[PDB]
Amino acid sequence: ATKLFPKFSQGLAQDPTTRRIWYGLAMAHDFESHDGMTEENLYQKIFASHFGQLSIIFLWTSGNLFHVAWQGNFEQWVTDPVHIRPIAHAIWDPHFGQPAVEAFTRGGASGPVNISTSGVYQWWYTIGMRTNQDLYVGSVFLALVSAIFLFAGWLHLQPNFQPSLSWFKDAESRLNHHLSGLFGVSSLAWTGHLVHVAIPESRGQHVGWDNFLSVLPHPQGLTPFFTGNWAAYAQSPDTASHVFGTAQGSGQAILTFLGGFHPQTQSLWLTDMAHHHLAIAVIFIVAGHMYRTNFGIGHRMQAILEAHTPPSGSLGAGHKGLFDTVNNSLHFQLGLALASVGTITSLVAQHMYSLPPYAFQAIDFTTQAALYTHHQYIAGFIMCGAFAHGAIFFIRDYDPEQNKGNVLARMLDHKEALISHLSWVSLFLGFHTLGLYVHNDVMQAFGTPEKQILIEPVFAQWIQAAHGKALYGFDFLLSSKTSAAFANGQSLWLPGWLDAINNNQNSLFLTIGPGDFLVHHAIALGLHTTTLILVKGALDARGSKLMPDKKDFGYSFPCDGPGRGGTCDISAYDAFYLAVFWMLNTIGWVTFYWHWKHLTLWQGNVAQFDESSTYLMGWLRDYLWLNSSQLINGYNPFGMNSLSVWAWTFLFGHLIYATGFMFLISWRGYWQELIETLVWAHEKTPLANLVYWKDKPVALSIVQARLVGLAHFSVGYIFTYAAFLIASTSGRF
Amino acid sequence: PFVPPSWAPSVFVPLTGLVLPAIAMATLFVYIEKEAP
Amino acid sequence: RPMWYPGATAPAHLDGSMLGDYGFDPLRLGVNKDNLKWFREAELTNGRWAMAAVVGILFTDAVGLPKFWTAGAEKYALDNQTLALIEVAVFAVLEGKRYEIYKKTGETGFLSFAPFDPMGMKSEEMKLKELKNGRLAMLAFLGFCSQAAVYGKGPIETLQLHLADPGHNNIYTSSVGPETAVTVAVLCVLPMIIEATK
Amino acid sequence: AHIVKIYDTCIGCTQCVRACPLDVLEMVPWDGCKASQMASAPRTEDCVGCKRCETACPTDFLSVRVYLGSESTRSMGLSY
Amino acid sequence: GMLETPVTSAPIVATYLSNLPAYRTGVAPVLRGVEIGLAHGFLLAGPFIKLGPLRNVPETAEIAGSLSAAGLVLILALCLSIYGSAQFQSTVARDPLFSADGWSEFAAGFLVGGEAGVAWAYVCTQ
Amino acid sequence: WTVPTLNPDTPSPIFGGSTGGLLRKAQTEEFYVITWEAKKEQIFEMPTGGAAIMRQGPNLLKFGKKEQCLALTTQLRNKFKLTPCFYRVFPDGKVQYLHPADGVYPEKVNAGRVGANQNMRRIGQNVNPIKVKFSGRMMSPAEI
């Protein structure tokens, strides 16, 4: 009979097989495919889901704060943040034997704990947290915020509180409020916290809710701000002998732009960060008054889009009708948001390792490596999702009649040229990068290392020289002492920036050579190939020569059968599917390069990387084989240490990856026949045929098989690299 | 203070690991196989 | 017909046919008619057990006998291994006879006696009094355990300590103060939440 | 159940009906082609979705299309 | 039609299967559950006692093994209860065991029998 | 022509049995019965595996799905040039004639057949999915 689950799909509820549960779980968030769904109901469900997501995020943050305040060593880590390892949380496992108990008992705790690698200790220490009471109060506050967000999500679904469809389409009002309030006012408030709490707490002065109304952030007290003498806030900054957390060497300035890093914490100045947030707050608030909402002044995005067509007709109709195809399509907005968020996540990773913002973050090698790898993998997944949603937009929301002659239609008009050129770039990069690598490998194998091709990256070195690095000797722009660009910043920020960039002990514009050139080309190959697969799948989503009516089958369908030569993996979903492997490979190459260069930097031997990164054998032996010795020795027949959990996780990831290869290689048919034999065996077995199944056992579908195999592949990939990176970086240092 | 007792992990870890998942799995299993009227 | 707050509304399945109805079912677990009878019987037996347990705990503190949470550790004139075997052996037959009573009649019973009332005061008003007293005793037992968890000592001792300084000795000034204060505020806001949406 | 559709480009070659392994298609009289016949799908409740009919269609593009829809015991080809 | 072999057609195995409590077809389901539970708990107490993590420590190996077997019996009873709730929802002679009330009584009988079997297996080793 | 009626007392081909036969679905949901006339005793291949011997005259067989019945029909028509027919039988005893539905095989056109699921347009004339969006459920542009 018809089952209750899933309530959103009547066709799935009538399915008498096990496929009903799987499809009900995988199509729960596809509100557009639900039964009796309207546009207004769609937007309302997304609103409630957004509130629930915020509730989960805030609860997770409160949980991290609570566990650090309860089972951590934050009160002891602030005293000696160079020789004390941060504690994530305690370990309570009845499966642990005695050696595992004393092995994980470290960091000054009274029992087995986990050493945190997220870097929340440095972040909380920099923003002003000093005691466990502060973390406890922050945890309770975030839990209350999470409960409020959850209640808001439940409340916006009840009658008299459901927003209308017209409210969700007010793009001008939403953009104005997000730029001025969500971005500008939030940044201004963060500036207020840095000026009022973080900066005085870094100078040994406690400023909490009990005394912030009686403690002045500056000795002049708002007089220079109102009189326009803003330069008075940059007078007397922290000297080079300032000790973080104490008043020794501290200054009085609150808004500076010294640049560079703090001599002790090796991080950005707090006054510089406060000034940064103040400037971007003013800029975002000003930008929040651009669109017309209810007072006559402002813009209409439709007018700006319609008045942006070239006169010669190079772009056809230009952007006519682009306002309606974006405002009425949620997949277009989701794709744009994911593309920007993925790029910003990558930007965060690069800027965070190169310019550490939190105190004593550069010394924590495990934290730096884990944070960079985490943000780069998150960025790669988000980028793949952006392109997948672009393909979904082409299939479900693109209207050729409304987008007639504009840039959107012209993209599909010459999609063959785009795919062909992406293919050519990827082919050239792959052929040459692989050829140079194999050539260097043959030269190193034959005992002639002077015969390998080592192309110097003169363009990137030229840019590094433009930033102030005098190692290469170009002597121009910031590298030349007689340039206008150099002389115009010598009194504001160039001294600190130049001192930091010319220091070879940090990660600020590291020295590069032929190995960096080759790996950068490998990165370019990965980016271009992943882009080729994603772009080709989005452009061919509506159809191709093999499947002229692909848009009539949806975004995800198994195939079109073995006819016409065979149509396996013809849908756009399959294109995203194949692109996830390339994304994992690209992020693997970038994280491998980052980890090896930083490992050789921290070990004090950059020549090892410079001489072994030019051939793949050096990558396999000097980086993968050499750095995994301590990892695989976490547990051996002679005993175990605290690093055994990473060894177990290493083997765990290998097992999950290999398990994924099963769903990836073997296909449905074999499993369906095997399941039929199992059905017969259960039906003909006494004492067991009395227990019957409620859902008919069937093999996983083709699409489900691909998703399951990719999920196992990605999980094994991530867990294996995370275990190796954390174990190698923590054991070495 | 918000500090939990010393015996809090010995009670919450077995709860969240065996009691709560068993109840959740049983309730979810009954809900999935429930037949519509 | 009073409800569980000034201005509630029955959830379309608590019209009032059952005794002690106040329209309290936010989780809607009694939506099934078959489950409503079983849940009612469970509520009645839980209330009876809580009534006897609360009277027993209150009587032990007056005489001076060991505390209810430490009476098990005391050594009696028997073996705990034999006590558990006898307890499950007797209760197997007792619960089996009580379950068969509910299938034939629908209420509780003792052994082979379904309407167990040797005196005979089984009235409609008496059935509702049993439910009200059982609910009150269930809350009382939860209060006994909670007071012994944070304060220890005892129920009678807790009441005696509360009279010494009622403004300073309460659940809000104890170790679970902020949690119960936030919960009380959320609960006080709850009827307005239900009335605002309806 | 799956959705099987016949289009006007059908030439009435009856190759799709002969290739159907569950007797879903048939031939009905028509006047839009030389063969004076047209394919039809009056028993789509028994269609499994093997797409053999699409493989047997000679028109460009195909005159018969199978869109995988709801799954049941018959559409999944389950003998149990 | 079907394949008949001496393994599935011997009268001795048919009588042996008919003598089992599950194929009685005419007794109370609670009695069937009690019998099956006792027969299962008695054998279930063995592996936890002789192979558990506390198998080498004396005077507590049997205690830990019996407690583990009791917990397993409880989990199996919960599995039987949810199976009965999700299997019988609507609609020789029909066996009363294959019904909502019949399977619920069977699960309760299995729980009582399993716990009694575990307790009996514990004292049998003393 | 008139719709035939199933004869449950019809001899079955000589077969020793197999493990690929009927299952619980035949006793709880439905099953299929194929009948045909053979001019002589002949060995044929069973769709469920094995070799059976069809007897001279009427022959009846049971299968779990309609595909097995049509596969046997195709084998009997292409090899032995016979004319088989099958029905769908329900546990209550209801019999439903299935193929050939109108007494004539579907590969050859027959009068009286009403066309079903025919679109009076080509594939390229199908509308875009945006015009079909926000319908009762997941609908393809070909369904309209």
Secondary structure elements and their pairing?
This is part of a larger assembly, with chains A (733 residues), B (37 residues), C (198 residues), D (80 residues), E (126 residues) and F (144 residues).
Chain A: H1 10-13, H2 19-26, H3 39-71, H4 74-77, E1 87-90, H5 98-104, E2 113-115, H6 120-127, H7 132-155, H8 165-168, H9 171-202, H10 223-227, H11 270-287, H12 301-306, H13 322-327, H14 330-354, H15 365-396, H16 407-413, H17 415-445, H18 458-466, H19 484-487, H20 494-501, H21 514-539, H22 572-602, H23 606-612, H24 616-625, H25 629-632, E3 635-636, E4 639-640, H26 644-665, H27 668-683, H28 702-732
Antiparallel strand pairs in A: 1-2, 3-4
Chain C: H1 33-63, H2 80-104, H3 124-150, H4 155-164, H5 177-197
Helix pairs in contact in C: 1-3
Chain F: H1 24-28, E1 31-38, E2 42-45, E3 51-54, E4 57-63, H2 66-78, E5 85-89, E6 95-99, E7 118-119
Antiparallel strand pairs in F: 1-4, 1-5, 2-3, 5-6
Function (chain F): PsaD can form complexes with ferredoxin and ferredoxin-oxidoreductase in photosystem I (PS I) reaction center. PSAD may encode the ferredoxin-docking protein.
Subcellular location (chain F): Plastid, Chloroplast thylakoid membrane
GO cellular component, one term (chain F): photosystem I reaction center
How would you characterize this protein structure?
- Chain A: It comes from Chlamydomonas reinhardtii.
- Chain A: It is a multi-pass membrane protein.
- Chain A: Chlorophyll a B1 binds at residue 654.
- Chain A: GO terms for molecular function: 4 iron, 4 sulfur cluster binding; chlorophyll binding; electron transfer activity; magnesium ion binding; oxidoreductase activity.
- Chain A: Its main location: plastid.
- Chain C: Keywords: Chlorophyll, Chloroplast, Chromophore, Photosynthesis, Photosystem I, Photosystem II, Plastid, Thylakoid.
- This is part of a larger assembly, with chains A (733 residues), B (37 residues), C (198 residues), D (80 residues), E (126 residues) and F (144 residues).
- Helix content of chain A is 58%, strand content 2%.
- Chain A has 28 helices and four strands.
- In chain A, helix 14 packs antiparallel against helix 15, helix 15 (365-396) runs antiparallel to helix 22 (572-602) and helix 26 packs antiparallel against helix 28.
- Chain A has helices at residues 10-13, 19-26, 39-71, 74-77, 98-104, 120-127, 132-155, 165-168, 171-202, 223-227, 270-287, 301-306, 322-327, 330-354, 365-396, 407-413, 415-445, 458-466, 484-487, 494-501, 514-539, 572-602, 606-612, 616-625, 629-632, 644-665, 668-683, 702-732, and strands at residues 87-90, 113-115, 635-636, 639-640.
- The longest helix of chain A is centred in the N-terminal third of the chain and has 33 residues, at 39-71.
- Chain B is elongated.
- Chain B is mainly α and 37 residues long.
- The relative contact order of chain B is 0.10.
- Chain D is an alpha+beta fold and 80 residues long.
- Chain D has one domain (1-80).
- Chain D contains two helices and four strands, in the order E-H-E-E-H-E.
- Chain D is elongated and about 45 Å long.
- By secondary structure, chain F is of the alpha+beta class.
- Chain F has one domain (1-144).
- Chain F is built from two helices and seven strands, in the order αββββαβββ.
- Chain F has helices at residues 24-28, 66-78, and strands at residues 31-38, 42-45, 51-54, 57-63, 85-89, 95-99, 118-119.
- The chains are: A mainly alpha (733), B mainly alpha (37), C mainly alpha (198), D alpha+beta (80), E mainly alpha (126), F alpha+beta (144).
- Chains in contact: A-B, A-C, A-D, A-E, A-F, B-E, C-E, D-F, E-F.
- Chain C binds chain E through residues 85, 88, 92, 96, 103, and chain E through 30, 101, 112, 115-116, 119.
- Strand 1 (3-7) of chain D pairs parallel with strand 7 (118-119) of chain F.
